[PDB]
Swiss-Prot record:
Zn(2+) binds at H99, D106, H141. It is found in: Cell membrane. This is Indian hedgehog protein N-product. It is a lipid-anchor. Ca(2+) 1 binds at E54, T84, E85. The dually lipidated indian hedgehog protein N-product is a morphogen which is essential for a variety of patterning events during development. Binds to the patched (PTCH1) receptor, which functions in association with smoothened (SMO), to activate the transcription of target genes. Plays a role in morphogenesis of the skeleton by coordinating growth and differentiation of the endochondral skeleton. Positively regulates PTHLH expression during endochondral bone formation preventing chondrocyte hypertrophy.
């Protein structure tokens, strides 16, 4: 067994830029409702995840999130994974955010205990998200390749 080490504030894993090939890969452009690429987005209705649209994400993102949902409930009995941002149609992030193509989620615990977020980030990496960034005290940013 291995010690699960929480990510530090502002740490990202792996320790490379999000868009690198060993991470979540290149930005592919915004996905609009009208896009053909919009049909690669699937809604996530996992009853074990709290959703603050936020539900629309790629299959790989869905798989990683659902895996995380289990691990969080294990880590903290009685607590659930919570999503506060998923697919963004409204330019609320940087120039080229993976949020714009349904390949990123910002997450917390259901109890909004910010002291848990570093460990939540570690669980996200263990759950297979291709890039995990303890971006803010308000949430952890998790993304996947396409
Ligand atoms: Zn984010």
């Amino acid at each position: 067994p291995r010690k699960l080490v929480p990510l530090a504030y502002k740490q990202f894993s792996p320790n490379v830029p999000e868009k690198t090939l060993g991470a979540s890969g290149r930005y592919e452009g915004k996905i609009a409702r009208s896009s053909e690429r919009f049909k690669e987005l699937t809604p996530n209705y996992n009853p074990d995840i709290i959703f603050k649209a936020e539900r629309l994400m790629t299959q790989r993102c869905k798989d990683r999130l659902n895996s995380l949902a289990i691990s969080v409930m294990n880590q903290w009995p009685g607590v659930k994974l919570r999503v506060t941002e998923g697919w963004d149609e409204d330019g609320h992030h940087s120039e080229e955010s993976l949020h714009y193509e349904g390949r990123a989620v910002d997450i917390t615990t259901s109890d909004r205990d910010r002291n848990k977020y570093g460990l939540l980030a570690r669980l996200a990496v263990e759950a297979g998200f291709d890039w995990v960034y303890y971006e803010s005290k308000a949430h952890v940013h998790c993304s996947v390749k396409s």
